[PDB]
Design a protein around this nucleic acid. Sequence first.
DNA 1: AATCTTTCCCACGGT
DNA 2: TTACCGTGGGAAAGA
Lengths: 14, 420
Amino acid sequence: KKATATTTWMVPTA
Amino acid sequence: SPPKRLTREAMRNYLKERGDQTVLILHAKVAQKSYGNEKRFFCPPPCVYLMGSGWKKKKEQMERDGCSEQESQPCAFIGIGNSDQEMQQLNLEGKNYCTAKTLYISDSDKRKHFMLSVKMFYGNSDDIGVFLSKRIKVISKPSKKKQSLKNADLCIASGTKVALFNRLRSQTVSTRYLHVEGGNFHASSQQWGAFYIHLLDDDESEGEEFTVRDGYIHYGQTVKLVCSVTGMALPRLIIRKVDKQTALLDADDPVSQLHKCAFYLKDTERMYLCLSQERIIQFQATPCPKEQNKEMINDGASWTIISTDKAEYTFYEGMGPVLAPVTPVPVVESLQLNDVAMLELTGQNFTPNLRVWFGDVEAETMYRCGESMLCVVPDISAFREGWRWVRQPVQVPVTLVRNDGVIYSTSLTFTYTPEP
DNA sequence: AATCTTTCCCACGGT
DNA sequence: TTACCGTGGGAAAGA
Ligand SMILES: OC[C@H]1O[C@@H](O)[C@H](O)[C@H]1O
């Protein structure tokens, strides 16, 4: 009941 | 005279070398039907993948036996199963995958569910077979009423998979799919990601490790989208309901299939997940006049959500090429242990010409139906020479084998456990 | 009748 | 340019 994202991507801004 | 059965030595060779051939079919769980002469294409487009090291091995074996490069090339067609609609060729040259971009289902077909049918053979016309997708539900069009959880069918459970696409001004050429490539999120015209949508409780902080909650996704909840292939994730998002070109901040009904969605980047200043051509960015929403419960969003910030599925089949020519197609390929979901020790297999596409092998030991097998088989567990002494009982745990692979030597691996093992 | 789903219609803005 | 085409919003028909 717990997940593992390998990496969290940063979302660039306009 | 019948073809050669699998020998124990051939099984041992497979178990060392492996070299499975695998077919994957990725597709949406629902599809909107087309009336009259119109074509409402399946979106995302179903994608066939040829996975595993066995494709290259099979290609080399064939060319060794005198096939040209073109004769060894796999070919594939896809269509609506059990249907008068024509099949369409998939182009796999130079790739291990191809999407089917112009499939549709006519209302001439009166079925409520259907499967895609993928027909495969090699360039020298050697047959491979016909592989079926998972079941796909036909809809006339999405309802405009709030979704009831009694229709679990059309809802989205935490931890399942969705695709997300953006389309500008009703133009099919503008369709772009969220997709991860080269460690970056982008919006692809031709490829699509299948993303876990994980529900997080409201106070769950940012991070790569996070507690997931069960249940159906509702608007206003915090979610984590994770590529089921790369593991890349987006920051925490709040899935919001789109109404015309505004995100509703107060909606909290269940998310349903083909709904238009916006993704607010949690703890930002009205920043929403947004495409700009192929680029994925965040773009600030504009406050609505007077109405404080809605925000105006960019064209690129509206996303259609749709649940997706996966059919997967694995086979190996354990005694070389065979006359019969390798399909239908058996799939084992589960093993259950039951006088004599019996192991029950649950799955699909079982036939009476299959036998269960534990390691390299073929076992007496009882066919019941396509979803259930029984086999007798071999004595431990078949794996440990002197043992009159299980001294320590001993783990062996479970494998299905057809009477013509085709080998169908499972991901499942059997473990002899010591007697306490 | 009243209301939701299914089917039919058609124009926008793309090739 | 004209001819043609998925798509989404609405009208109409069905339950
Ligand atoms: O007048 C309606 C149109 O206005 C635009 O903002 C939307 O794309 C259309 O719904």
